[PDB]
Symmetry: C3
Subunit: 85 residues, 3 copies
């Protein structure tokens, strides 16, 4: 089983709106960590998706909607051996 990991790094304030985007898309497990750019006023999302299309779907939505007016970093990579509960 190949799984995709979508990282979104944005500003703390966007925690609730970006979480909501993630759920309403139907994610299978997302994690958040606190982070600092160049104070831990940023947050890092890690969203695991069964298809590259859903990862692309969530990335497109967050970019189109917040990429311009907020500091944002997003990227995708593949992972193996997902066991999730």
């Amino acid at each position: 089983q190949q799984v995709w990991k979508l990282v979104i790094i944005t500003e703390e304030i966007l925690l609730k709106k970006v979480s909501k985007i993630i759920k309403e898309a139907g994610a299978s497990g997302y994690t958040v960590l606190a982070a600092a750019g160049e104070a831990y006023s940023n947050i890092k999302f890690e969203v695991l998706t069964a298809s590259r299309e859903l990862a692309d779907q969530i990335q497109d939505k967050v970019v189109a909607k917040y990429f311009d007016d907020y500091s944002c970093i997003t990227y995708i990579s593949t992972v193996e051996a997902l066991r999730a509960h």
Copy 2:
């Protein structure tokens, strides 16, 4: 020749018990990060770097067999290059 990274995302309460499995299997070294997760940061993220896929598989089966049914737990594996430690 190949380094593998094993991620275990689980409840903060298993920090000692998961740390024990990781140590008793004799890994290249690990880091733990506070985190929060859904479908405050009450979870922990282990990143375990192993010299072989088999060792990573072995730490992972164990954790899974022991704690997966009863605790929120996410785990998966991927490859890294250029490891200095």
Copy 3:
């Protein structure tokens, strides 16, 4: 379509500014810093459009420290990068 390298440096908190300046001076866009535990460490994630640039930052860092500071570092690749 767009292959990108991600350098991870996990090191003692005491070296924040030092390695931050190595990452700066080496010309990389920026980075992310996460607090971690080994006790208390920082984890840098640096994105480079060139594998070249990742290994320079790696070289200088492990050159100076590593031999008398706790240090883990490694590289991998990501794709579909967007940044602002």
